Each structure stands twice: as C-alpha cells, then as structure tokens.
C-alpha cells in the first residue's frame, strides 16, 4: 500500500508545492548576442543542472518512491524534456513573447534562429506560455500537471498503482478548481483544457528530442554523460 493515496487534496498540493525545484541561473557573461555554439552551450549547461534538481523533485512526488528503481528510471527517461519544457513555459508566463530560461537568460524568437530548427519549437513554447497566460494557470495547477507528466508519459511503455495516483491527482485538480469558485461545467471544461495541452507538450518534447539527437550527431557542443544517457533510450 502507498502513502500517496491516503493523502488528502490539500496534503497533495502542499507536498507538491514544497517539492518545487528552484529557478537556476545561466552563466553570467553579458554577451547577449549569441551563436549556435554559445546558445546550446548555455542551454545544455542549464538543463544538466536542472536535471539534478528534477531527479530529487521526482523522489518527492507522492507515489514515485513506491516504484521500483527500474520503473523510476523509465519514467524520468521518458518525461524529462517534457518536464523541463513545462517548467520553462510556466516561468515564461509573465514575459509574453519571450522564454525565460533563467532570470538572467530571457530570449525572444529572433534569438532562436541561431540554432537550426530551434525557432520552430521556440514558437510552440511561446504559444504554450501564452495559452497558460490566457487560462490564468495557477501554481497549484502547474505542479499537478507536471507530476501528471512524470507518471503518465512512460506508463504505457512497460501497473494499477500509477493509475491510482493519476486519479488522485485528477481529484486534486478538481479540488483546486472547486475552491477557486468554478462551477461543475467550468471544472470539467478546465480540466480537459489543461490535459489537452499535455498532448502538445508531448509533441514539443518529441520534436525537441529529435533535434538534441542531431546536435549530438553534429557535435556542435560537448554533451555531458548524463545528457547523453537521457538522449539514449529515446532512439
């Protein structure tokens, strides 16, 4: 039996909020003009460090520690880029037209053209952020969505435990929407809207993974062993 199921809705929210990773900084060189090599250098260094925080965040996701080590490896391997992307989109909300990779690294789409194929995924990320902005996505909603991605994205490449946790998070999302005053129809409509964005986040990760694999093949920037291992098991 898992402790996550005995948690209440508020206990679920607090646990997720308390486990939020911190917002990291990029390197502090003021060269705002970027090249393809310096662009991907800053991003891979940033994402490597975010990955370490993601893995410790994952262990704090209710129900995630109840899984075997192999199952935990599989979910993180499948979901890591998705989780980075929804984090990026989330913290880019209050900066329309730009992507806040770090507080000291705020990029617009003209800078995405430095890397081949970045601008296409850039625009999708901007579109997702504006979508969150128009929906007024709350932080309590965000942390639920992110944990959903962690437990959902790899569940079908393997059992009732994860699905019981997924239902629990759905209960939590509705609980949050009921507190904010939404009617019954507004509750299930908003739930559906939030979950459909997850299909696009999955799409952005797939296309993003393809391009990180080409950057590996192009050897534009040296990749870490940890990033290379995350890139593997996707090919």
């Amino acid at each position: 039996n898992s402790l996550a199921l005995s948690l209440t809705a508020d206990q679920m929210v607090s646990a997720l909020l308390d486990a939020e990773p911190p917002i990291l900084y990029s390197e502090y060189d003021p060269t705002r003009p970027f090249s393809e090599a310096s662009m991907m250098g800053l991003l891979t260094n940033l994402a490597d460090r975010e990955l370490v925080h993601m893995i410790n965040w994952a262990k704090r996701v209710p129900g995630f520690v109840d899984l075997t080590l192999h199952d935990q490896v599989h979910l993180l391997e499948c979901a890591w880029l998705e989780i980075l992307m929804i984090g990026l989109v989330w913290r880019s909300m209050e900066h329309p037209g730009k992507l806040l990779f770090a507080p000291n690294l705020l990029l617009d789409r003209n800078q995405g053209k430095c890397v081949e194929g970045m601008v296409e995924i850039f625009d999708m990320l901007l579109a997702t952020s504006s979508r969150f902005r128009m929906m007024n996505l709350q932080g309590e909603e965000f942390v639920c969505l992110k944990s959903i991605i962690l437990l959902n994205s790899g569940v079908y490449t393997f059992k009732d435990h994860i699905h019981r946790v997924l239902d629990k998070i759905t209960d939590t999302l509705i609980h949050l929407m009921a507190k904010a005053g939404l009617t019954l129809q507004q509750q299930h409509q908003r739930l559906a809207q939030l979950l459909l964005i997850l299909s696009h986040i999955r799409h952005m990760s797939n296309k993003g993974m393809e391009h990180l694999y080409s950057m590996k093949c192009k050897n534009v920037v040296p990749l870490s062993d940890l990033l290379l291992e995350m890139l593997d098991a996707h090919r």
Binding site: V52, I55, A58, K59, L69, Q72, V73, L76, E77, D225, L226, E229, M230
Partner: peptide
C-alpha cells in the same frame, strides 16, 4: 550502469 541509477538512490 546508468548515472540516473546513482542519482535516484542518493
């Protein structure tokens, strides 16, 4: 062996 294995157990 995977680095991810080491990081999850720590």
């Amino acid at each position: 062996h995977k680095i991810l294995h080491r990081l999850l157990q720590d």
